[PDB]
Amino acid sequence: ETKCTLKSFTVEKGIYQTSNFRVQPTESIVRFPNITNLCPFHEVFNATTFASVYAWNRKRISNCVADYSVIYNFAPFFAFKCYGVSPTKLNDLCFTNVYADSFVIRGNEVSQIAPGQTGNIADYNYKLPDDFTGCVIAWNSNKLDSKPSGNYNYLYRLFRKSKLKPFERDISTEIYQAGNKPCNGVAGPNCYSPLQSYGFRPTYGVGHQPYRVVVLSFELLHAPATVCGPKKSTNLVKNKCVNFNFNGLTGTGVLTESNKKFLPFQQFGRDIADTTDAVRDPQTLEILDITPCSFGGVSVITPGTNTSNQVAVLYQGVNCTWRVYSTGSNVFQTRAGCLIGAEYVNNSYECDIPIGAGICASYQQSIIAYTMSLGAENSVAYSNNSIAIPTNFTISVTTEILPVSMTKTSVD
Amino acid sequence: CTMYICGDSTECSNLLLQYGSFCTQLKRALTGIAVEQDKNTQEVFAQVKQIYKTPPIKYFGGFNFSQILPDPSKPSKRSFIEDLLFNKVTICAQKFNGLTVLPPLLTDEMIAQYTSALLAGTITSGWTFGAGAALQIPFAMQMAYRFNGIGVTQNVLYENQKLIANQFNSAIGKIQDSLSSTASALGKLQDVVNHNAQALNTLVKQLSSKFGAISSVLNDILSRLDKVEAEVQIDRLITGRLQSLQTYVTQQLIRAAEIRASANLAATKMSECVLGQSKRVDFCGKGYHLMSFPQSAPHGVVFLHVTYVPAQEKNFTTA
Amino acid sequence: SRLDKVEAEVQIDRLITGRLQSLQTYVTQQLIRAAEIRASANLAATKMSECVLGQSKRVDFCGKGYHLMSFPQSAPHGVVFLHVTYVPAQEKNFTTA
Amino acid sequence: CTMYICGDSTECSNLLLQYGSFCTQLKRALTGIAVEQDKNTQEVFAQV
Amino acid sequence: QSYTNSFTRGVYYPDKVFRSSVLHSTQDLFLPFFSNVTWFHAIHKRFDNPALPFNDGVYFASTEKSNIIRGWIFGTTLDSKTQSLLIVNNATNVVIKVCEFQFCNDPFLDVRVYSSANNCTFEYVSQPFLMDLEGKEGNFKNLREFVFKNIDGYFKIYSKHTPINLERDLPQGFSALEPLVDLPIGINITRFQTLLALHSYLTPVDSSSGWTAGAAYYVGYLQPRTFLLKYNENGTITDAVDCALDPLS
Ligand SMILES: *[C@@H]1O[C@H](CO)[C@@H](O)[C@H](O)[C@H]1NC(C)=O
Ligand SMILES: *[C@@H]1O[C@H](CO)[C@@H](O)[C@H](O)[C@H]1NC(C)=O
Ligand SMILES: *[C@@H]1O[C@H](CO)[C@@H](O)[C@H](O)[C@H]1NC(C)=O
Ligand SMILES: *[C@@H]1O[C@H](CO)[C@@H](O)[C@H](O)[C@H]1NC(C)=O
Ligand SMILES: *[C@@H]1O[C@H](CO)[C@@H](O)[C@H](O)[C@H]1NC(C)=O
Ligand SMILES: *[C@@H]1O[C@H](CO)[C@@H](O)[C@H](O)[C@H]1NC(C)=O
Ligand SMILES: *[C@@H]1O[C@H](CO)[C@@H](O)[C@H](O)[C@H]1NC(C)=O
Ligand SMILES: *[C@@H]1O[C@H](CO)[C@@H](O)[C@H](O)[C@H]1NC(C)=O
Ligand SMILES: *[C@@H]1O[C@H](CO)[C@@H](O)[C@H](O)[C@H]1NC(C)=O
Ligand SMILES: *[C@@H]1O[C@H](CO)[C@@H](O)[C@H](O)[C@H]1NC(C)=O
Ligand SMILES: *[C@@H]1O[C@H](CO)[C@@H](O)[C@H](O)[C@H]1NC(C)=O
Ligand SMILES: *[C@@H]1O[C@H](CO)[C@@H](O)[C@H](O)[C@H]1NC(C)=O
Ligand SMILES: *[C@@H]1O[C@H](CO)[C@@H](O)[C@H](O)[C@H]1NC(C)=O
Ligand SMILES: *[C@@H]1O[C@H](CO)[C@@H](O)[C@H](O)[C@H]1NC(C)=O
Ligand SMILES: *[C@@H]1O[C@H](CO)[C@@H](O)[C@H](O)[C@H]1NC(C)=O
């Protein structure tokens, strides 16, 4: 591994770095609140003739537990476009509040439910949030809403004067006042009333059929949980590196018993790092501290490849005294970290390959680690009337290499 | 690399491979800083390698060096000043996002032994322990050889060596209170400690950033967006997160250059303030410099410069 | 040769940013090293101007031991100093006064 | 920070907040050099 | 009516997270420090109907023994034309009715509230907000603090029953107002009032003429400002500092 990092077949000596320890998780526990009541999504799906686009039927779905099978009860799905959330994974995630809206429109207006566009619906009549964290569900219902006599009973406010803000009701008298004269609603001309009859008969073009369009809107990253697909509430574990799922947000780490306080309405544990580290049990009142599994950092100690091949491995900040999969010849517990593959000694020698915290390794036919030898212990005989005067010299010559300049470079 | 930029997601690490070779330069730069910060303390302290020991009877003249000599009473062998300095100078949240702190090679037990070595040599062998083999020399006689370096004759010390001992000892007794009077003196070291601490803190907080994406967290965006549209949100998350790391490493590079510039000054000052007696003005204290005594400190060194300043002047007529 | 104008720009532009950022990083790192290489080069000039042209009374600057003189030697992208120093060797002790 | 990146537009300043804490470290960086450049003249000239 | 200053009131938990001995800065609706809190007639005899506008939240504080103040009205027009909100703190169970009632100029549930318009889209039953009543202590015992915020169709109210014995207007101290219930409806609020409770006890004799337009509740408003606060090791909010006050702040 060290050779691969260095991009060479010979490594000289010293410490080296590789990928971290990365203790793998054992399994995943997914704890859900406790609510088992069936949520009535069929009411907003296949009721009687729904209202037109001029007056939507907004609903507030909450406190229930719901899944994605009852939505899949309907085959003729046409406008299955899903925004924000992928359709295949609308399960096992907890929203905070889901708003369901229903209306009936024609074929040429189905594509108008997309945000950031101008159309018949997207004009003054209806406005929708251009971020649109939710999704759109629609299917053909030309066999039910359509009538042989002609469904002229549905209107639509196309010609209203002012624009519209997203998520705003538009149901009013809407007198028409346009042109360079006050019509007052009686004059006659320039009335062009916005309301008009759709015209729904079972003999028409493909792009002019009635549909049941239900749009869903919601948001995420909220402490309370409202509605999510069922998942078996497996018993929790302690001190085991496990994946977890607590009403939405997931993560990997060990769970520890309560040591903090929290408040009756308080259930999160965000810290200065702004990462969740203390959560409450969704089922009962248990405070759990979330400390993700201990990261590593693997360091390889090697003498010369031209000298030997045996190596030693160092894990910085990882205790062993411990969850290290398989062990080796020996295990040491330096303050720097966990060292394996090297044999500690009792002597002291000059440092040649650094390890940390006053310890270095060396190659004796084996790799040995030791403390520091600062130098030979010398005691100088200091006396009130004693002096030592030299009687001979030694004219030595020493080098000293200092860089002066580096190669000049240019670019274009 | 990925541990900081992303999580346990292979797709995010796959998208980081598009950048490809940004890690190898980033990890190399920080390792170069650490390996040279580790070496940086070597020449400042390990100026002499003979580990001298003070004589059992600490009679270095009438001078009182108990305030600077290591005391065996403490579990860690340190002087009166060093223990005061240890207490006068004062994490996990960083250590789950990718950051670590490699321990220094030289612990304080050996660092204090290095200072004890120099201190023993600067007292028993005076300034000889920096030129060759140490040669003992009485401390009363050593002073008369430091006065001569300032154009003051031998006998000036000897007729009032009792006053010299009474006065240097009094000054060394006061330096404990003066250093303990306020914490403004240690501001040169507490500056480097919290500045690195706040540099790490401002790096951890940068992960919780809405860098043009729907959310800062990584796991949720996988469960939210499909492949054809999740990348356009996660890519701008990678660019910003990489930029924050790139900014941090550069700021460390300037700081590392500045720290070693001061460390070289300390090494040069350690190499002649105590190993000798400099004729340079103000380099080794204020006034005519006599000697100095090193004292270790967290992430730094402290020098107790001993100088000679005239005080009582009577003006005469000359020719 | 592959993409048309309206959609080739969206790809080359991010290639432009990455190639420019790599150049910015290289130049920035050169600035720190160039400042550092001058820091030692100023020390070499000071050492050359004082160890070689004179005998420095400061200790440990012009070698190890009591310094006598120095002889400069050239080297690729650097300089080498041969510090000739005087160190004592044979130490008989005596009683003093 | 904002005055330089954007004019008197609130929407631009709201955009800057998405980065959050990028300008903070810029002001602190310029304050450190400025406070140290006034300290250079002190130790060069106020020696007596 | 009368004007009174609120010193360090209107501080509440802005989110549902827990922090220990840290300092957190947040930006949202907050009652500014040292603001003009409208203190109404400090008697009770008295029966007034002040037109109170609702805008950007309302801080409501009013100590009162025997819980004479029980009701609460919200809305914009209150003539069965648009949606409205109602609270009854029936002192063993709280009833919340977001409906379209009719309401008189001088409402009074005891010795005549709506008499018509009784159909809507909300029913609620929970533990009453007020604690217990019939406290005839000579000195003041408890103080009530309430904050309402109608945003994102997520009508939130916060409460805080605290014991005070100082008998002089608002206590001078920081209060850790705590959220208790969230009501997602989505309504338009611009005006609000409240209701009292008192029995003549007999219809023939002196039915209703004893009252003048002088009915005492503190009303404060909220402004969007940054109010970096401080936590302790238990997690209860200790002190908060306003970032728009004097430059020392
Ligand atoms: C709606 O769907 C349910 C699901 O089975 C069915 O029982 C019911 O009859 C349907 N109602 C109408 C009006 O189609
Ligand atoms: C869920 O609620 C029921 C109430 O019927 C209760 O009996 C049960 O204990 C709750 N779940 C847990 C895990 O306590
Ligand atoms: C490796 O060792 C052999 C034998 O000692 C020697 O001939 C060779 O030059 C060495 N190579 C290197 C790169 O050290
Ligand atoms: C590892 O854990 C053991 C047992 O708690 C402890 O004695 C030892 O000091 C630990 N090692 C480190 C480096 O903290
Ligand atoms: C030296 O050997 C003794 C005898 O077993 C042992 O107790 C001691 O820990 C050893 N010292 C070191 C530093 O390993
Ligand atoms: C020097 O004299 C002092 C008393 O003044 C005495 O304590 C000390 O032991 C003497 N030292 C030696 C080495 O004789
Ligand atoms: C001094 O040492 C040298 C060897 O370095 C030796 O040749 C010479 O004889 C010595 N001088 C004396 C006086 O012993
Ligand atoms: C040196 O000073 C210390 C502290 O003032 C004192 O305790 C000690 O006795 C002194 N030494 C002598 C020899 O007086
Ligand atoms: C200096 O000495 C002279 C005599 O030589 C005397 O007159 C004078 O007062 C002294 N002080 C000054 C400041 O000149
Ligand atoms: C120093 O010389 C004396 C003789 O004057 C002798 O007794 C002693 O052993 C020598 N060495 C030391 C370390 O004192
Ligand atoms: C409160 O209103 C009064 C009456 O206008 C005014 O004099 C006073 O300055 C106001 N105080 C504050 C804090 O708004
Ligand atoms: C008041 O509360 C009690 C107990 O919950 C209930 O029986 C009664 O009907 C409530 N009265 C009203 C008007 O809601
Ligand atoms: C409730 O009142 C509203 C407003 O007057 C009215 O439109 C609606 O039809 C009423 N509902 C019932 C069930 O009477
Ligand atoms: C709320 O009512 C006021 C007063 O009629 C009106 O101006 C405002 O537009 C309304 N807001 C909404 C969201 O309906
Ligand atoms: C609550 O905080 C106070 C102030 O820090 C402290 O004295 C008290 O012990 C704490 N109570 C706990 C931790 O339950």
Author numbering:
A (entry chain B): 298 to 618, 633 to 675, 690 to 737
B (entry chain A): 738 to 827, 850 to 1078
C (entry chain B): 982 to 1078
D (entry chain C): 738 to 785
E (entry chain A): 26 to 69, 77 to 143, 158 to 245, 247 to 262, 264 to 297
What's the paper's own text on this?
The dense glycan shield consisting of 22–23 N-glycosylation sequons per protomer is an essential feature of SARS-CoV-2 S architecture. The glycans have been shown to play intrinsic and extrinsic roles in protein folding, modulating conformational activation and immune evasion. The transition to the ‘up’ state exposures of RBD for the binding to hACE2 is also a prerequisite for S-mediated viral fusion, directly correlating with infectivity. Here, we dissected the role of N354-linked glycosylation, acquired by BA.2.86 sub-lineages, as a RBD conformational control element in attenuating viral infectivity.
